[PDB]
Design a protein around this ligand. Sequence first.
Ligand SMILES: *[C@@H]1O[C@H](CO)[C@@H](O[C@@H]2O[C@H](CO)[C@@H](O[C@@H]3O[C@H](CO)[C@@H](O)[C@H](O)[C@@H]3O)[C@H](O)[C@H]2NC(C)=O)[C@H](O)[C@H]1NC(C)=O
Ligand SMILES: *[C@@H]1O[C@H](CO)[C@@H](O[C@@H]2O[C@H](CO)[C@@H](O[C@@H]3O[C@H](CO)[C@@H](O)[C@H](O)[C@@H]3O)[C@H](O)[C@H]2NC(C)=O)[C@H](O)[C@H]1NC(C)=O
Ligand SMILES: *[C@@H]1O[C@H](CO)[C@@H](O[C@@H]2O[C@H](CO)[C@@H](O)[C@H](O)[C@H]2NC(C)=O)[C@H](O)[C@H]1NC(C)=O
Ligand SMILES: *[C@@H]1O[C@H](CO)[C@@H](O[C@@H]2O[C@H](CO)[C@@H](O)[C@H](O)[C@H]2NC(C)=O)[C@H](O)[C@H]1NC(C)=O
Ligand SMILES: *[C@@H]1O[C@H](CO)[C@@H](O)[C@H](O)[C@H]1NC(C)=O
Ligand SMILES: *[C@@H]1O[C@H](CO)[C@@H](O)[C@H](O)[C@H]1NC(C)=O
Ligand SMILES: [Zn+2]
Ligand SMILES: [Zn+2]
Ligand SMILES: [Zn+2]
Ligand SMILES: [Zn+2]
Ligand SMILES: [Zn+2]
Ligand SMILES: [Zn+2]
Ligand SMILES: [Zn+2]
Ligand SMILES: [Zn+2]
Ligand SMILES: [Zn+2]
Ligand SMILES: [Zn+2]
Ligand SMILES: [Zn+2]
Ligand SMILES: [Zn+2]
Lengths: 379, 379
Amino acid sequence: QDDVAPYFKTEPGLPQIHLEGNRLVLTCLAEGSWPLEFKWIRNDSELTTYSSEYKYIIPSLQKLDAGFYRCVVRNRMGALLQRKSEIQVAYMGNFMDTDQRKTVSQGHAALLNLLPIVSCPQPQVTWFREGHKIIPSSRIAITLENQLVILATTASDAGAYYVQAVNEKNGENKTSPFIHLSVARDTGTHEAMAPIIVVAPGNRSVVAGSSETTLECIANARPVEELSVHWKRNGVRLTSGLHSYGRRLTITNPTSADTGMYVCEATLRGSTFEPARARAFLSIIEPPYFTAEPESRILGEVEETMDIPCRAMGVPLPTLQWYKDAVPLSKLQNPRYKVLPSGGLHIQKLSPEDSGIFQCFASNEGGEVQTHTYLDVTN
Amino acid sequence: QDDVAPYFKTEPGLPQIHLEGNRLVLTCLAEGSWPLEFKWIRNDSELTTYSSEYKYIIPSLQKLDAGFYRCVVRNRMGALLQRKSEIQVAYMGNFMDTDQRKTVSQGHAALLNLLPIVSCPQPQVTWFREGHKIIPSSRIAITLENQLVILATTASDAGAYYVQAVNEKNGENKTSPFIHLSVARDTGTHEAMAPIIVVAPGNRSVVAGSSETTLECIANARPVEELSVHWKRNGVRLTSGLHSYGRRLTITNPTSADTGMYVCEATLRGSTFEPARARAFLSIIEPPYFTAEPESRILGEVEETMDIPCRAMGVPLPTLQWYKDAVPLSKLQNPRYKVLPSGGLHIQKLSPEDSGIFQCFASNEGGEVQTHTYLDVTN
Ligand SMILES: *[C@@H]1O[C@H](CO)[C@@H](O[C@@H]2O[C@H](CO)[C@@H](O[C@@H]3O[C@H](CO)[C@@H](O)[C@H](O)[C@@H]3O)[C@H](O)[C@H]2NC(C)=O)[C@H](O)[C@H]1NC(C)=O
Ligand SMILES: *[C@@H]1O[C@H](CO)[C@@H](O[C@@H]2O[C@H](CO)[C@@H](O[C@@H]3O[C@H](CO)[C@@H](O)[C@H](O)[C@@H]3O)[C@H](O)[C@H]2NC(C)=O)[C@H](O)[C@H]1NC(C)=O
Ligand SMILES: *[C@@H]1O[C@H](CO)[C@@H](O[C@@H]2O[C@H](CO)[C@@H](O)[C@H](O)[C@H]2NC(C)=O)[C@H](O)[C@H]1NC(C)=O
Ligand SMILES: *[C@@H]1O[C@H](CO)[C@@H](O[C@@H]2O[C@H](CO)[C@@H](O)[C@H](O)[C@H]2NC(C)=O)[C@H](O)[C@H]1NC(C)=O
Ligand SMILES: *[C@@H]1O[C@H](CO)[C@@H](O)[C@H](O)[C@H]1NC(C)=O
Ligand SMILES: *[C@@H]1O[C@H](CO)[C@@H](O)[C@H](O)[C@H]1NC(C)=O
Ligand SMILES: [Zn+2]
Ligand SMILES: [Zn+2]
Ligand SMILES: [Zn+2]
Ligand SMILES: [Zn+2]
Ligand SMILES: [Zn+2]
Ligand SMILES: [Zn+2]
Ligand SMILES: [Zn+2]
Ligand SMILES: [Zn+2]
Ligand SMILES: [Zn+2]
Ligand SMILES: [Zn+2]
Ligand SMILES: [Zn+2]
Ligand SMILES: [Zn+2]
């Protein structure tokens, strides 16, 4: 009857990373009764006013333009809110031009942290010692956080260390100042060192159906050539997915059967030392999906009870928030509406102002899904 | 021992769609014994020669630059091949400036196909009839392929139809030529038309863990207001996920429990007609993941048997192809190597030339995963 509330024809997709200086165009393509008006919101902050323009163009991207973008479509029926889309910008700043110093006792592991640098994403790092490149070996490792771990340091390891960082999205490179490493002699007890875990695998959670995830576990011992790092699950040692001298375990395409505890066990062959063990817990997060959605339109007699269902499942439990014509009920401050723990919304006393778009957003760490309905209040 | 075969520090990610004229930078970030050399391959065609440059820059993107890109890293040990990354370019051409004509009998459904236009992705379409916008109603639908379906056509539906197409990535719009629709009178049997499915839901397969998928089923009958389209599974009618007058069923976050048959059933209320039914089969494709990978390095005595394992799982079964220093064994034409159905590779007689990188690519419709190993041939 030419009284159709807006709805989106396009599903905003996955996060996209774009280079600086590039032209970016965002579209708010909806379907409903004409004329329609569109406005844009970035980080819960309005960018544009309502107009007939359905696209937002950034001729040259900047670091500030990055954020979560939304668009609001509105007509005589009400206003509808789009699912947020993450717009990331590729940028790489400089290091702070101040050299650092660090001293480590001989035989103990030395961890050199990548000097602070702002970059999205974090650049890949190539470590050097006075021009000579450092390759990961049995006693040298590079963490997922670009930390240089030198197991069983010696007097030959003293020197100025630096990196060449490269951003994998825009290709820019930056050279870091020096970390002057000094190795101090400790008295020669260090002939056989018990295996001790230096970088332990922390708790990790990943999205369902994702490509792969990688846990890291680095240990130190002497002699380092006899050091063996293994991975166990349910008390059973693993074989597939290992990388980088057994220090990285990659679980590819994890499901609900891959959740639980993974144990890192570092042993020293030919020795009676107790193996050093660490715990790591892998969790699978499920994106929210509705098991009950409100019908597209619902009639309502003035001052009569009304329940608007909205139930969603997924791990962890999705958190739900409502909107009335693209306005949160938390900021709407109306005692007429009352949120329901089971999922829906309860409105006991109606009013001619209650007519409009009601939108239920279910969100967790795995993203968000939204449903909506138009409340028609009879005369 | 400073003899490390190359391996990639970066995991090439999901397909990315970029606008025309934008600057694109691709990086081949690997780790191994220096110096390393890099070259780029697009659509199994070499773009650059071997050099010390690790990035490939397109200052201004074009429609021709779209394709699957790979990079090859090489040193004294051998050559390694990167997983392909899909580079899509946003472009929108024009329609062929020639109007079309179509005649449909009165009371029968009329399908108007979107006129041919080259665009990536396919644009969202807004249908018009001589300036007046056409909104989907109980007798008017728009398919996923942007087809205009007019159920129970009448004499008032005759006229020139056209569209305004908008590319959702770059925002460009194009206006289509006219489809002159003529409605021809057929003798008045058309008072109660049995429900007949016009657009049936075909077979559909989607990736595991994907956001959502949508099946479409459109039917025609008279009177159209009494037409009801429902969805059944296991003989049980569905309630959630329905859209567009019950013509679209959206299965969000499908798993192995959502595969099987979905039935579309269109009924005419208040009538004794037989419901029109259609079959649609939803399949879940699992990306390939290795259950057995070859160790990073393997020793080999000259002219001795050798088996290199490489087993992967996923639905449908992954297809495996091998490479020797980034060169396919199919094009290598060596009877020494022989592929194994169980998964691996069998080399019975060795040779000093057999030393190098061997790479096993497991690929299906859900993507590809690769493993590699260095064959060291003893003197
Ligand atoms: C718009 O909102 C986004 C999201 O809040 C802002 O991105 C934030 O930017 C900060 C730094 O500016 C980043 O912090 C990063 O997150 C980790 C979380 O563990 C933090 O520990 C690190 O320091 C890391 O740098 C991150 O991208 C993000 N922070 C959060 C909490 O989301 C963005 O800056 C906002 N832009 C505008 C223009 O408002
Ligand atoms: C590099 O290779 C890609 C992949 O083969 C090429 O993309 C191809 O481009 C065609 C049209 O140029 C497209 O065809 C499309 O696929 C469906 C498949 O059902 C087809 O029926 C439609 O006609 C649709 O247009 C598609 O993007 C793709 N085709 C295939 C089979 O992959 C690309 O053009 C190549 N570029 C260069 C520079 O070599
Ligand atoms: C790191 O980036 C700089 C640019 O910021 C590169 O320096 C360029 O080198 C090329 C030839 O090698 C010159 O034509 C350019 O003029 C240089 N740019 C500037 C701003 O001077 C440098 O080569 C990069 N390093 C690596 C290892 O790739
Ligand atoms: C479709 O795109 C054209 C451009 O190709 C738009 O025409 C522009 O309109 C603005 C103001 O409306 C002018 O400032 C530009 O000069 C126009 N461009 C050209 C090339 O003339 C047109 O507005 C778009 N249509 C819609 C509905 O957005
Ligand atoms: C990891 O999660 C487990 C779950 O019980 C918890 O016991 C442990 O303390 C967590 N560790 C960290 C470092 O958060
Ligand atoms: C869809 O798949 C089923 C599976 O058996 C098959 O029987 C049917 O013919 C297929 N239909 C089409 C249109 O491919
Ligand atoms: Zn880009
Ligand atoms: Zn200094
Ligand atoms: Zn120590
Ligand atoms: Zn000591
Ligand atoms: Zn909906
Ligand atoms: Zn009304
Ligand atoms: Zn782009
Ligand atoms: Zn004409
Ligand atoms: Zn018909
Ligand atoms: Zn007839
Ligand atoms: Zn590997
Ligand atoms: Zn050797």
